[PDB]
Amino acid sequence: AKIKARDLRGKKKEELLKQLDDLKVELSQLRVAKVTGGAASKLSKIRVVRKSIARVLTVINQTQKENLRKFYKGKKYKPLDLRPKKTRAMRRRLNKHEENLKTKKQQRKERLYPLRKYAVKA
Amino acid sequence: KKKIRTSPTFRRPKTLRLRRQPKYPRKSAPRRNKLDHYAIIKFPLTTESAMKKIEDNNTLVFIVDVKANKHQIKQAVKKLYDIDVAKVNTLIRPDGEKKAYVRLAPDYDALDVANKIGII
Amino acid sequence: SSHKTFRIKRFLAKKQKQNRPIPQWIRMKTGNKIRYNSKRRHWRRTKLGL
Amino acid sequence: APSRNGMVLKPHFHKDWQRRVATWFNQPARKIRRRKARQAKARRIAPRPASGPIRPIVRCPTVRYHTKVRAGRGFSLEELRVAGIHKKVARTIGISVDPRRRNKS
Amino acid sequence: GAYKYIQELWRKKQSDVMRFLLRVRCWQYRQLSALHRAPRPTRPDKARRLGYKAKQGYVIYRIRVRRGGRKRPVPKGATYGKPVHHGVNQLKFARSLQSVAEERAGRHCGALRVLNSYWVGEDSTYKFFEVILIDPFHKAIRRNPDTQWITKPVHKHREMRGLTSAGRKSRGLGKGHKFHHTIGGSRRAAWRRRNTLQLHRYR
Amino acid sequence: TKGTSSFGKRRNKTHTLCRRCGSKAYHLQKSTCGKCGYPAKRKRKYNWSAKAKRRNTTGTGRMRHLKIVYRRFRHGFREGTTPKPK
RNA sequence: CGCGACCUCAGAUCAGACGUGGCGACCCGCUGAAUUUAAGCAUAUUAGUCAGCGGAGGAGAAGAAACUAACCAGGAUUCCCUCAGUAACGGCGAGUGAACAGGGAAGAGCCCAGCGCCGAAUCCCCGCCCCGCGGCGGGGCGCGGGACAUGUGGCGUACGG
Ligand SMILES: [Mg+2]
Ligand SMILES: [Mg+2]
Ligand SMILES: [Mg+2]
Ligand SMILES: [Mg+2]
Ligand SMILES: [Mg+2]
Ligand SMILES: [Mg+2]
Ligand SMILES: [Mg+2]
Ligand SMILES: [Mg+2]
Ligand SMILES: [Mg+2]
Ligand SMILES: [Mg+2]
Ligand SMILES: [Mg+2]
Ligand SMILES: [Mg+2]
Ligand SMILES: [Mg+2]
Ligand SMILES: [Mg+2]
Ligand SMILES: [Mg+2]
Ligand SMILES: [Mg+2]
Ligand SMILES: [Mg+2]
Ligand SMILES: [Mg+2]
Ligand SMILES: [Zn+2]
């Protein structure tokens, strides 16, 4: 009955939340058994259920985040965790369009006097 | 005439202050409530003083989160164990977790609640 | 003192939680070179700077 | 103290020199670096003549060296005019104008 | 021709018209606060020949500097040791009041770039300058060539690194025999180059 | 009597823990850290103690964000892409 | 005894952005000693150095002559060799101390204001849909708002136009 994210990524959020909260019920029971002595089998399934909980919460957060990205796709103002992250200085620097902007004088110079290609024979 | 300053003090005239209508939310989704009921209650306590409290004062005793207050502990117990709670006395232990004694309503019984939980 | 603040209680909680002997399976671990907890504090001998 | 006979010397070592001691252990490495930079530049301008524009002939400006001649910074606008080419197409071709040099001869 | 007339008029500073205007504007700048935003340049010809353009993203700040020399900040006038270093009173700061005006403007509006500055009347007690600042994130400025160099990140706090016009005049660098002290780029670059010891591999 | 009895009279702390930098050098009356200088925005740092500078410079702690920056720099600060699933 | 227009200011959890702090080996701007040496010591030296303060970048600063020179002249900046422990400064004591020419490494040049002409030609922001999204623009449309003649853009900058 071991759960995998490739099988988790097709469910709907009602059964995903159901799976999540039965896992949390089982983790609570396992900690009760841990205090009351229980058994080494239960103490070893503690880590299994915890990693399963981490798996389920990863899948839910990832689905919700990609739905948010799809909704904000093509919008003018996106939230601060949906705009890119790269580096503060790289965010401060110019974008390619206003980098490649040029003046009419300088592009007129470029049209009038292009740098030629040439060799000098000996 | 007919507008008259009846006071020697000029005060800053009150103006309009618009509410915010932002073009985009600063964060995407509301943050998940990471202090839910399963986070509130960690496990019961099963020491001899705990058993005395169970058989005498109709009260259970849990190790709970440090951030949880008596209202959250009472609501979490009443929800995930489906009982009624008379009161909640909490302390913080010298190890650093919150020990919460929860005394049940008199129509319920701590013995059979502990039997359903499994600490018995 | 009995009158504490929450964060000095947290500090003392951490200190007394980590004033504890080393487990015994650590010595059976491969490549151990640690025999006992060498930084154990006794309340009468070495005082917390707090 | 002076011993018997010798020069009066004045060593300029009174000024904490051995923080600003500069060594030359990176001299072969920087020779390799400049060499491969020249190679990269040449194969970047692969048909262009590998060293820069043509420089003019220039008389060295002192009675010690005014018999010799050397490469100058660039050709001037008057001699570009007598050669009959424009001062922008000259630099696109590879001629290295220098506008601030005069011709008095 | 208008700006040429204003330029000649502002060179005629001791005329009765200009001395009236300078006195009344000095009075009102004295009544204002020390750091202040002007709504427009008081001297538009001077501002435009110093770089200002009437666009969105160019702002003007009026700065007031308490003028006079620099007094040594030692307690009870007691420096300790060497009578050559005993001086307290007649000492002089190495930078100009115009440069410290630009520096105060930059340090307050630290999200803008100091382009330049000029003089708009002094006092006996104060000196009033106007500093041209540029917002380096306005589109009208970084969506136009010939001015996005100041939006480039190597130009943060030009007035604090000493490389506006007034700060450069304070640094004292030029071409020729008047300026041998700074002949490697700056004063301590020159000091470093002529006080290092080149110990070659093969000496 | 300046020795042992005067040691007897010591029961009021001058310093407590600091919110920044965590050392026990927060002067309670002065309201200032003697180690890091806190209430102030800039950290206290002096070139005359290189041992102190190396006791609390960058790299003596956890460097969570910085180790992720080092990895992401080695790969070029890419975002929004996936390793092309099987 | 009002209603507008501008100017000069103010307020806002107004719409969208930006700065702060860290590190500091190298870089830039200030500030800046005393030990020491002078067989004492005060100018000098240490030294424009240490300590102190501010600001950066992958380099920084500098930089296309209000230059060198006095030649049959050279030709931005930076760095190396040399000039040179020299010219010079200095209780002319102790000590300090460059530049130009020359040979190399590298090599790249440019833009405003002003003066003038072109029906402001100019720029920002907001909606419409179309062609794109993945560091977000292209053009079109609006009897749509603002900036701007208290001067935006094109030509054009001492080598002239
Ligand atoms: Mg133009
Ligand atoms: Mg209590
Ligand atoms: Mg004791
Ligand atoms: Mg002296
Ligand atoms: Mg006290
Ligand atoms: Mg807002
Ligand atoms: Mg002596
Ligand atoms: Mg002696
Ligand atoms: Mg003595
Ligand atoms: Mg220092
Ligand atoms: Mg900083
Ligand atoms: Mg630069
Ligand atoms: Mg520059
Ligand atoms: Mg010699
Ligand atoms: Mg000297
Ligand atoms: Mg070469
Ligand atoms: Mg014009
Ligand atoms: Mg020129
Ligand atoms: Zn602190």
Swiss-Prot record, chain A:
Range of residues in the leader sequence: none
Domain of life: Eukaryota
Residues recorded with modification Phosphoserine: S28
Residues recorded as bearing N6-acetyllysine in the entry: K18, K42
Pfam families with a match to the protein in the record: Ribosomal_L29
CDD domains: Ribosomal_L29_HIP
Cellular component GO terms, alphabetical: cytoplasm; cytosol; cytosolic large ribosomal subunit; cytosolic ribosome; membrane; nucleolus
Biological processes, Gene Ontology terms: cytoplasmic translation; maturation of LSU-rRNA from tricistronic rRNA transcript (SSU-rRNA, 5.8S rRNA, LSU-rRNA); translation
Task of the protein: Component of the large ribosomal subunit. The ribosome is a large ribonucleoprotein complex responsible for the synthesis of proteins in the cell.
Annotated protein name in UniProt: Large ribosomal subunit protein uL29
Swiss-Prot record, chain C:
Function field: RNA-binding component of the large ribosomal subunit. The ribosome is a large ribonucleoprotein complex responsible for the synthesis of proteins in the cell.
Gene3D superfamilies: Ribosomal protein L39e
GO biological process: antibacterial humoral response; antimicrobial humoral immune response mediated by antimicrobial peptide; cytoplasmic translation; defense response to Gram-positive bacterium; innate immune response in mucosa; translation
Compartment list: Cytoplasm
Matching InterPro entries: Ribosomal_eL39, Ribosomal_eL39_CS, Ribosomal_eL39_dom_sf
Coiled coil: none
Xref: Pfam families: Ribosomal_L39 (PF00832)
PANTHER family registered for this protein in UniProt: LARGE RIBOSOMAL SUBUNIT PROTEIN EL39 (PTHR19970:SF0), RIBOSOMAL PROTEIN L39E (PTHR19970)
Swiss-Prot/TrEMBL keywords: Cytoplasm, Ribonucleoprotein, Ribosomal protein
Superkingdom per UniProt: Eukaryota
Assembly, per entry: Component of the large ribosomal subunit. Interacts with IMPACT.
Annotated family: Belongs to the eukaryotic ribosomal protein eL39 family.
Gene Ontology CC annotations of this record: cytosol; cytosolic large ribosomal subunit; cytosolic ribosome; extracellular space
Organism: Homo sapiens (Human)
UniProt GO molecular function: RNA binding; structural constituent of ribosome
The protein's name: Large ribosomal subunit protein eL39
Swiss-Prot record, chain E:
GO cellular component, one term: cytosol
Biological function: Component of the large ribosomal subunit. The ribosome is a large ribonucleoprotein complex responsible for the synthesis of proteins in the cell.
Complex and partners: Component of the large ribosomal subunit. Interacts with IFIT1 (via TPR repeats 1-4).
Cross-link (Glycyl lysine isopeptide (Lys-Gly) (interchain with G-Cter in SUMO2)), chain numbering: K82
Annotated coiled-coil segments of the chain: none
Region described as Disordered: spans on this chain: 164-185
Compartment(s): Cytoplasm
Biased composition range(s): Basic residues: 168-181
Gene name as annotated: RPL15
S-S bonds: none
Protein source organism: Homo sapiens (Human)
A Gene Ontology biological process term: translation
Positions where Phosphoserine occurs in the chain: S33, S96, S99
Sequence intervals crossing the membrane: none
GO molecular function: cadherin binding; RNA binding; structural constituent of ribosome
A Pfam family it matches: Ribosomal_L15e
Name the record gives this protein: Large ribosomal subunit protein eL15
Swiss-Prot record, chain F:
Alphabetized PANTHER family for the sequence: 60S RIBOSOMAL PROTEIN L37, LARGE RIBOSOMAL SUBUNIT PROTEIN EL37
Keyword field: Acetylation, Cytoplasm, Metal-binding, Phosphoprotein, Ribonucleoprotein, Ribosomal protein, RNA-binding, rRNA-binding, Zinc, Zinc-finger
One Gene Ontology cellular component: cytoplasm
UniProt protein name: Large ribosomal subunit protein eL37
Family, per entry: Belongs to the eukaryotic ribosomal protein eL37 family.
Gene Ontology process terms (BP): cytoplasmic translation; positive regulation of signal transduction by p53 class mediator; translation
Gene from which the chain derives: RPL37
Pfam families for this protein: Ribosomal_L37e
Subunit structure: Component of the large ribosomal subunit.
Cellular localisation: Cytoplasm
Residue list for modification N6-acetyllysine: K9
Taxonomic placement: Eukaryota, Metazoa, Chordata, Craniata, Vertebrata
Record-annotated membrane-spanning stretches: none
Binding site for Zn(2+): C18, C21, C33, C36
